[PDB]
Amino acid sequence: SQQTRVLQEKLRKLKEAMLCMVCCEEEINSTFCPCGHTVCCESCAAQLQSCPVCRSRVEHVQHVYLPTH
Amino acid sequence: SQQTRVLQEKLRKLKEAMLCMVCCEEEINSTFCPCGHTVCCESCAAQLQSCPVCRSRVEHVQHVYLPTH
Numbered sequence: 001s002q003q004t005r006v007l008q009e010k011l012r013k014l015k016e017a018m019l020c021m022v023c024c025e026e027e028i029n030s031t032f033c034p035c036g037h038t039v040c041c042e043s044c045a046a047q048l049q050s051c052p053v054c055r056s057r058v059e060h061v062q063h064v065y066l067p068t069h
Numbered sequence: 070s071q072q073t074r075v076l077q078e079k080l081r082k083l084k085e086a087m088l089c090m091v092c093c094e095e096e097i098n099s100t101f102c103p104c105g106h107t108v109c110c111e112s113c114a115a116q117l118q119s120c121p122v123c124r125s126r127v128e129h130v131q132h133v134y135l136p137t138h
């Protein structure tokens with residue numbers, strides 16, 4: 001039905017929100033500290049000296065184990 | 070259709086996986102450091118001395134800003 005299409009779009013958007021904002025390919029699993037923005041995979045987070053959301057300096061990267069993983 | 074019901078179930082399960090494992094009411098937004106388990110809301114994470122998943126000592130809690138928030 002049309003509701004099947006609506007639900008498919010909601011699921012796609014929720015799944016896309018869990019993917020890295022830089023490479024768009026791998027799941028988010030890393031936090032920039034101390035700002036707390038958790039928007040990258042471990043490979044993109046390792047290559048950024050500044051947070052891509054707020055531009056704060058990245059002091060270090062914390063790996064996150066999320067139940068959605 | 071039956072496909073609409075299957076998609077509704079997938080959406081519901083993904084949304085439930087984003088909720089605090091202790092209170093089941095608030096969104097997960099806190100990480101236990103250094104282990105990295107990100108399973109609680111700020112209130113529930115505040116008084117735990119050890120991780121409820123792996124038993125590692127919690128040295129501090131890092132707030133996380135997730136795109137799914």
Ligand SMILES: NC(=O)[C@]1(c2ccc(F)cc2)CCCNC1
Binds near residue numbers: 128
């Ligand atoms: N000890 C902690 O877990 C907090 C904290 C963490 C790191 C830090 F540099 C200062 C304070 C304190 C307040 C609430 N939870 C966060």
Ligand SMILES: [Zn+2]
Binds near residue numbers: 021025
């Ligand atoms: Zn990436």
Ligand SMILES: [Zn+2]
Binds near residue numbers: 035052
């Ligand atoms: Zn940031």
Ligand SMILES: [Zn+2]
Binds near residue numbers: 109
């Ligand atoms: Zn809670």
Ligand SMILES: [Zn+2]
Binds near residue numbers: 101104106120123125
């Ligand atoms: Zn843990």
